[PDB]
């Protein structure tokens, strides 16, 4: 099968956030509460939702759809998306999601066409560039690459979106919903279930759980486009992973003291 | 069946049930409970027959002194109900009596009208067939 239930339990993909931060509409994916303070999930629901999303993304990638991976979150998520893009040639937006990346696609298409033209001009090279103008062109290349390096490949609106956190990507999921594009996400007890189509009840704070699930989706894509897989349909000795640096791991949401009353009074 | 919370009901039997049903529909709630009266039991029987509810179930205390009726709404797979709105006609104070000639047709026949003529509550179509009318309780569509 896809994964092992004890493996999910060990990667802690069945722990959400503190009970304080939760959307009541996500009560379906949480079993009746208990002395746990971090909103444990239902493992069968996790596996079922993951299998459904896997099947859909596999179908899209086999039928040659264009999927876009979006993480503009912690540096680990950024590097994870970059590695997944290296593994499979899917489009990605690791930097900030630009306003209207999908609903205003014409202007960003103009920008990426300009980026491609500048890139080929620089590659063709010329002695007229000298030093100053060459440096300015290189800096422009660097900026449009940092902000459009994953979008340059596509020429048309993508057929599917994969979001690491719908709460953080509220703009991206809103654009996907207004354009009627499928969007899958790793909901983490604080997300509105209506916006996401293929909900995957999961963790979003654990750098091991997010890595495992993101690599599972990438494994679906890579199997559909036919390379050897990475995590899916694999034993423990190859599924095992490490915990990034910098007793047990602490998925506790803290720092409530930085939420003061809005400036008021007269 | 065992309960934990106290159960109360309004003095007006038609609009109590209508408020419960409308609030449950708007809040997507499925199961609700209320105090049981025979008018409410008959009206829920005709709602179940017409297919606006899944089930209604009456229960009695161990001492046979109190009765409560609990019913569930009929939601589809995508979770949108079959009831679209409820409006009560024969409110307390102003009671509405209409003969057969003026028996109303709710939403061009899409909805139903609850009429308690002489044989308990009765749908608009069967009241028209029987050619007799009476008190008009509520509009449900």
């Amino acid at each position: 099968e896809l994964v092992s239930l004890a493996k999910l339990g060990e990667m802690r993909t069945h722990v959400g956030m503190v009970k304080r931060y939760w959307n009541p509409k996500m009560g379906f994916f949480i079993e009746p509460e208990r002395k746990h303070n971090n909103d444990h999930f239902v493992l069968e629901l996790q596996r079922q939702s993951l299998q459904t999303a896997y099947n859909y993304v596999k179908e899209v990638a086999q039928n040659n759809g264009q999927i876009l991976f979006v993480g503009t979150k912690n540096d680990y998520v950024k590097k994870l998306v970059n590695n997944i893009a290296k593994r499979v040639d899917v489009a990605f937006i690791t930097q900030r999601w630009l306003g209207g990346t999908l609903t205003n696609f014409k202007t960003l298409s103009i920008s990426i066409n300009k980026l491609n033209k500048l890139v080929e001009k620089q590659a063709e090279n010329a002695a007229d560039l000298t030093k100053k103008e060459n440096l300015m062109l290189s800096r422009e290349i660097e900026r449009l690459e940092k902000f459009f390096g994953g979008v340059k490949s596509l020429k048309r609106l993508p057929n599917l979106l994969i979001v690491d956190d719908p709460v953080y990507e509220k703009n991206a999921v809103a654009e996907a919903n207004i354009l009627r594009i499928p969007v899958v996400a790793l909901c983490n007890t604080n997300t509105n279930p209506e916006l996401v189509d293929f909900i995957i009840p999961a963790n979003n704070h654990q750098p091991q759980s997010t890595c495992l699930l993101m690599n599972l989706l990438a494994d679906a894509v890579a199997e559909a486009k036919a390379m050897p897989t990475m995590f899916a349909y694999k034993p423990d000795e190859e599924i095992q992973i490490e915990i990034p640096q910098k007793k047990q791991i602490t998925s506790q949401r803290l720092n409530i003291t930085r939420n003061p009353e809005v400036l008021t009074r007269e | 069946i065992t309960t934990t919370k106290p159960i109360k009901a309004h003095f007006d039997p038609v609009a109590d049930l209508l408020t419960k049903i409308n609030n449950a529909r708007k809040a997507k709630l499925m199961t609700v409970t209320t105090i049981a009266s025979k008018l409410k039991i008959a009206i829920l029987e005709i709602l179940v027959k017409e297919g606006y509810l899944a089930n209604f179930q009456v229960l009695e205390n161990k001492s046979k002194t109190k009765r409560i009726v609990t019913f569930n709404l009929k939601y589809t797979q995508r979770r949108i109900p079959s009831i679209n709105g409820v409006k009560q006609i024969s409110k307390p104070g102003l009671r509405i009596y209409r003969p057969f000639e003026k028996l109303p047709l709710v939403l061009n026949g899409l909805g139903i009208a609850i009429i308690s003529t002489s044989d308990g509550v009765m749908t608009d179509k069967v009241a028209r067939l029987k050619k007799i009318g009476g008190e008009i309780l509520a509009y449900v569509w």
């Binding site: 379906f28 459904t52 859909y56 179908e59 899209v60 039928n63 759809g65 057929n159 499928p182 279930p193 209506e194 996401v196 189509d197 293929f198 909900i199 | 029987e45 179940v48 509810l53 899944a54 089930n55 209604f56 179930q57 939601y75 589809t76 797979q77 995508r78 979770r79």
Partner: peptide, 22 residues
């Protein structure tokens, strides 16, 4: 009356089923 306990506890079910070409 009408009790069958159908159980329809599948909210927020996926709408799209399978991608296809014209």
């Amino acid at each position: 009356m009408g009790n069958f306990d159908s159980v329809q506890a599948n909210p927020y079910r996926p709408r799209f089923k399978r991608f296809n070409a014209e």
